[PDB]
Every structure is written in C-alpha cells, then in structure tokens.
Amino acid sequence: LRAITHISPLGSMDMLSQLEVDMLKRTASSDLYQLFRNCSLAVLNSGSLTDNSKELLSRFENFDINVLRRERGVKLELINPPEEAFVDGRIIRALQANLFAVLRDILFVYGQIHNTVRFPNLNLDNSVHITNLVFSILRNARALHVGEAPNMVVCWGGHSINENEYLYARRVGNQLGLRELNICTGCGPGAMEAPMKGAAVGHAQQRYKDSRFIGMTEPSIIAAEPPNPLVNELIIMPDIEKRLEAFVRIAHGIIIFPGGVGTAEELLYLLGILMNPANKDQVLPLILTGPKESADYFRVLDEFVVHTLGENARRHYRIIIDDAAEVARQMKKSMPLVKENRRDTGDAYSFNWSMRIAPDLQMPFEPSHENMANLKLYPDQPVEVLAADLRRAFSGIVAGNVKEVGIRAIEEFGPYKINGDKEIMRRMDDLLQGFVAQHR
Numbered sequence: 001l002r003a004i005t006h007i008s009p010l011g012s013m014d015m016l017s018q019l020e021v022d023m024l025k026r027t028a029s030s031d032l033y034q035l036f037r038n039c040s041l042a043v044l045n046s047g048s049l050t051d052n053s054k055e056l057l058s059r060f061e062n063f064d065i066n067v068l069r070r071e072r073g074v075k076l077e078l079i080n081p082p083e084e085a086f087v088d089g090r091i092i093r094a095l096q097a098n099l100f101a102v103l104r105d106i107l108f109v110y111g112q113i114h115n116t117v118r119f120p121n122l123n124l125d126n127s128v129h130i131t132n133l134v135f136s137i138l139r140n141a142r143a144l145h146v147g148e149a150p151n152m153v154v155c156w157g158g159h160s161i162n163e164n165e166y167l168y169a170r171r172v173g174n175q176l177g178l179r180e181l182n183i184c185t186g187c188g189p190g191a192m193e194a195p196m197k198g199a200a201v202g203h204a205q206q207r208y209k210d211s212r213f214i215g216m217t218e219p220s221i222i223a224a225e226p227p228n229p230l231v232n233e234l235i236i237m238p239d240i241e242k243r244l245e246a247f248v249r250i251a252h253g254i255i256i257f258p259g260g261v262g263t264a265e266e267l268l269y270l271l272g273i274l275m276n277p278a279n280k281d282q283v284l285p286l287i288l289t290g291p292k293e294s295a296d297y298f299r300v301l302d303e304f305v306v307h308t309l310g311e312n313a314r315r316h317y318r319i320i321i322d323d324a325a326e327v328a329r330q331m332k333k334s335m336p337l338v339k340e341n342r343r344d345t346g347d348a349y350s351f352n353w354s355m356r357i358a359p360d361l362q363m364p365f366e367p368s369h370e371n372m373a374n375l376k377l378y379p380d381q382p383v384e385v386l387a388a389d390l391r392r393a394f395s396g397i398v399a400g401n402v403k404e405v406g407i408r409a410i411e412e413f414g415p416y417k418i419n420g421d422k423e424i425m426r427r428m429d430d431l432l433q434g435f436v437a438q439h440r
C-alpha cells in the first residue's frame with residue numbers, strides 16, 4: 001500500500017549539526033508541513049508534461065514526506081512519490097537537488113525566520129536587516145561566487161504566452177548563451193523557461209562549461225507551480241518583496257518580455273529604484289524586447305511612462321523590437337561597465353549592495369480601501385515616489401476584480417479608484433484600454 005525510498009542530500013543541506021537536525025525535525029511536524037509537502041510535490045513534477053498545474057497536484061493523493069534524522073545529518077523519506085521522477089529506482093539528480101533546496105529555504109530559512117524566539121534580534125521592519133537577510137539567504141543557497149566577473153541576466157515575462165512570444169524569448173536566450181551569459185528567472189513556465197532552453201543551446205555551441213540557471217520563486221508560487229526542468233539552482237525567498245529585491249541585487253542586467261499588465265507593475269518597480277537620485281551613478285542595463293507583434297504593446301507602455309514620469313525615464317531603459325542579436329549584444333557590452341562600476345565603488349560583483357531600495361518598496365502591501373486611499377498619485381512629488389505609489393496602485397486593482405480578495409470587496413464595497421490627478425488617472429485608462437485592444 002506504500003512504496004518507500006530514502007534520498008540523501010545533494011547540492012545543499014549536506015553538512016548539518018545535530019541541533020540543526022533536531023530543529024528541522026519539529027519544523028517538519030509543525031503547521032509548516034502542508035507548505036513543505038506541497039512544495040516537495042511540485043519539485044518532483046518538474047518535467048511532467050501535464051500543463052494544468054493544480055490538475056496534477058491533486059493526482060497525487062498518496063504522497064507524503066517526512067524528514068529522517070541520522071547521526072551525521074538528514075535524509076528525506078518519500079512515500080508514494082511520482083514515478084516520472086525516477087530512473088531505474090534512482091531519483092534524477094536535478095530533482096534531487098531541487099528537493100533539498102526546498103528543505104533548505106522552506107524549513108531551515110522560512111520556518112526559523114518568522115520565529116524570533118529562534119533567530120537573533122532580526123528587526124524584519126528594518127530596511128537594512130531585510131537586505132542583509134536576502135544576502136544571507138543567497139549565500140546559504142551557495143549562489144554567490146567569489147571574484148566572478150558579472151555575467152548574470154535576469155529575465156521577467158508572462159506566465160503563459162502564445163507560441164509566437166515563446167520563440168522570440170528562446171531566440172534571445174540563444175543569443176545570450178552564445179555570448180557566455182547566464183540567466184535568472186521566476187522559475188516557472190512561459191517566459192521564465194524559454195530563455196533558459198535557448199541559453200542551453202548557445203552554451204553548448206560555445207562549449208561553455210558551467211551554466212547557471214537560477215530559478216527564484218516563493219512558497220505560495222512554487223507550491224502550485226512546478227519549476228521548469230532547466231533550473232539547476234533553485235531558490236525560494238520568503239516574501240514577494242524579498243524575491244524582487246533578490247532579483248535586483250544579483251542581476252547585472254534585466255530583460256523584460258511581454259507579460260500582460262503585470263509587466264507594468266514590474267516596470268514601475270524598477271524605475272522607482274533607478275530614477276532615485278541616490279542611484280544616479282549606478283549601472284544596471286534594462287532592455288524591454290518582444291517579437292514584431294508586440295510593437296504597439298510596448299508603444300502603449302512607452303507613452304504611459306513618458307507622459308507620467310517624463311522623458312527622463314528613457315535614460316534608464318531601451319526598447320528593442322524583434323531583434324534578438326542586438327538585445328544580447330547590448331547586454332554583453334554592459335558587463336564590463338557593470339564590472340567597472342562595481343570596481344569603482346568597491347561593491348561586490350555578485351551582489352549589488354550600494355543600490356538604494358527605498359523602504360516602502362521592501363514592505364508588503366494590501367489592496368484595501370484604506371491603504372489605497374492615501375496613494376499620492378500626482379506629479380508634484382518626486383518621480384521615484386510617484387512610480388512607487390503607481391506600482392502599489394496597479395497590483396491593487398490587478399487582484400481586485402476577479403481575485404478572491406478583490407471581488408470580496410469590489411462588489412460588497414465597490415471600486416475604490418483612489419484620489420489622484422485627473423490627468424494621470426486618464427493616462428492609466430489609456431494604458432488599460434490599450435492592453436485590452438490587443439487581447440492582453
């Protein structure tokens with residue numbers, strides 16, 4: 001009635017103390033179990049060709065996982081796991097490494113972090129501690145290499161995309177791989193998987209040995225979305241805001257693909273950091289690119305930025321339509337400039353400390369009628385503030401029409417549409433009307 005198998009640690013959690021093991025033990029038996037189980041299950045389905053995520057999560061009712069204590073360290077016990085994850089009775093290494101990546105970031109980091117009874121005085125409300133914590137997580141994930149030239153390109157894109165956009169992202173990935181650049185994404189399908197599949201080919205063509213494909217996700221996502229099978233360095237941050245800060249501090253360049261309206265929220269976030277005068281001398285290339293069909297999509301998005309943040313916004317990004325070689329060539333040229341930029345201030349090559357991220361951008365935000373109310377949506381205040389309050393505005397009603405939390409108050413309380421300048425509020429509907437005219 002039950003088939004069992006023991007997995008030894010690989011890639012992480014391979015050198016533990018007995019106290020740490022005992023800590024992991026109770027954590028695996030506290031309320032965190034449901035989260036820990038659903039994440040392990042998602043990892044074990046990376047590569048299973050059932051596109052419907054939640055469909056497959058139910059197919060495995062038998063599955064359960066427990067943590068085994070051994071004098072030396074820990075082992076993972078799997079009860080009735082998916083068959084497609086094994087080869088002649090042995091677990092596929094890639095999955096095995098992701099399997100213990102969950103053990104690390106969910107139980108060791110996530111479960112012991114909220115515990116302030118367990119960890120030292122860690123003021124989660126202090127902006128500095130957050131940044132250093134993000135660093136500690138990445139270091140614990142063995143994702144920060146010493147004295148390595150900048151070659152990491154973060155990529156953001158839509159969850160599900162048409163076959164047309166997918167090919168362009170693959171092509172861009174290939175051109176990035178052909179130039180010995182590595183890739184970091186949201187660890188999912190769609191635009192978060194295509195650039196990796198393409199970069200793998202280029203690396204092979206260039207005989208590039210150690211590809212780094214970093215999937216950076218969070219518990220609520222990975223619990224329902226298995227990671228794409230290209231990810232070879234999995235990382236799960238505790239909060240949404242900590243995941244986004246991780247993206248910014250490890251990246252040496254950022255490429256944004258069409259992601260529907262979410263692209264706007266993602267774009268405003270970056271501008272809120274770059275257009276901060278404290279970051280005037282920072283060097284972080286930003287390219288927004290897409291197939292020939294996404295011409296007007298980015299046009300609409302560009303007019304919005306100009307008409308609200310000013311032409312000054314364009315000195316921080318470049319739009320490239322249907323040219324993969326140019327996108328990759330731009331990023332390759334910027335790497336020495338990043339290296340030179342970090343070297344000019346003494347910053348680390350693998351992690352951007354000096355980049356000032358305002359504390360408002362590191363804290364969670366809830367789309368209630370109160371928080372939204374005091375959104376300063378006029379152009380009189382600093383540009384970097386307007387962009388911050390604009391991000392918190394989009395995602396506010398993003399999940400506010402059909403999301404289980406938005407319509408619980410959108411038809412019981414109605415739309416809020418917080419006070420702002422009559423001109424700015426229209427340039428948005430022009431943006432929303434524009435995305436609708438293209439079936440986004």
Ligand SMILES: Nc1nc2c(ncn2[C@@H]2O[C@H](COP(=O)(O)OP(=O)(O)OP(=O)(O)O)[C@@H](OP(=O)(O)OP(=O)(O)O)[C@H]2O)c(=O)[nH]1
Pocket residue numbers: 146147148342343344345346347348349350
């Ligand atoms: N900013 C930075 N430097 C790093 C990093 N990892 C290694 N380094 C190296 O540390 C060295 C810099 O130390 P120093 O030689 O004393 O130069 P400093 O004037 O003191 O710079 P600083 O005061 O820190 O701002 C350089 O090596 P070399 O120049 O001697 O050789 P190579 O050219 O091959 O890289 C850097 O390449 C890193 O993550 N960030």
